[model samples]
Target: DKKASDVADLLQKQLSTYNDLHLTLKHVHWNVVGPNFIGVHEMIDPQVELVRGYADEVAERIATLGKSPKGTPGAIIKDRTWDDYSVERDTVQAHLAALDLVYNGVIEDTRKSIEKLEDLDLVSQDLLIAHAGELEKFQWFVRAH
Candidate 1:
């Protein structure tokens, strides 16, 4: 249980980021409109799935660290690094803008967590680093359009 205790908070923060990003991606997917609707919509589906996957991974990490994961919609609200998500329907470009904000925000938060852990937790750091890489790829995909 020492391993679980060692990185509980680290994994917890990552869990929060993933939860927030996951739903926000959903928000973007639901509201996006424009000529490229299908492309943007399809793009977001995979990204949200990616977020859900990582959320589970990081939550498992917390459980591995011997702590319960906090990931409810309400709990995630407090730990969110992503900007306020929009409820109003938006244009395709606007959806991309919102996504860019949160993706970059989550990516930045993950980097901060990595730095916070420093050499103290390479296992967690590597996980977050991988997340950051995939997030950047998603970001690039959004910006490319």
Candidate 2:
């Protein structure tokens, strides 16, 4: 399909987004304190692990489509649409508040990417659909706090 390479480019951004999210989750885990500190801290570790796996899957898909997946820190920073996560050394509620917005951005962009592949690459679209569902659930957990 002529859209193969096109879809890969879309996935590259998704890969970058996931990479950013995992690290941001780790940041929240380590820095959040006060009022349900242990619960929020423990909850974030699993999200970090899952988002890292998501990044790996997206990168693999890009390679499968014959493009080199850019996983470097500089590459992610260069292409990311948002700024760095800045809620350092904050309360659980404070961090979760910021995380809610973070998930909103990631999930929104992920859905948009999935939509772009509707007629182009069903395989890639499926991958993102699953990712979006998980991310939505994770955000719900954050909001529940």
Evaluate residue 49 in candidate 2 and report its C-alpha lDDT on the 0 to 100 scale. 87
For 1-145, candidate 1 gives per-residue lDDT tens digits of: 5554657877787898888777777877777777878888778888888889999988887776667999897887776655577656877877787677767777777778888777567787788888888988998888865
- For every model shown, what is its TM-score relative to the native structure? 0.89, 0.95
Q: How much is 111 displaced in model 2, in angstroms?
A: 0.8
How high a TM-score does candidate 1 get?
0.89
Identify the runs in model 1 with alpha carbons over 4 angstroms from their true place.
1-6, 81-83
Which stretches of candidate 2 lie above 4 Å from their native place? none
When summed lDDT is taken over every stretch of 10 residues in candidate 2, the lowest stretch is 1-10
The clash count of every prediction, one per candidate, is 1, 0
* lDDT tens digits, residue span 1-145, model 2: 5778888889998999999988788888778889778988677888888999999999999999987999999989987999899888988888888999999999999989988989889988999999999999999998876
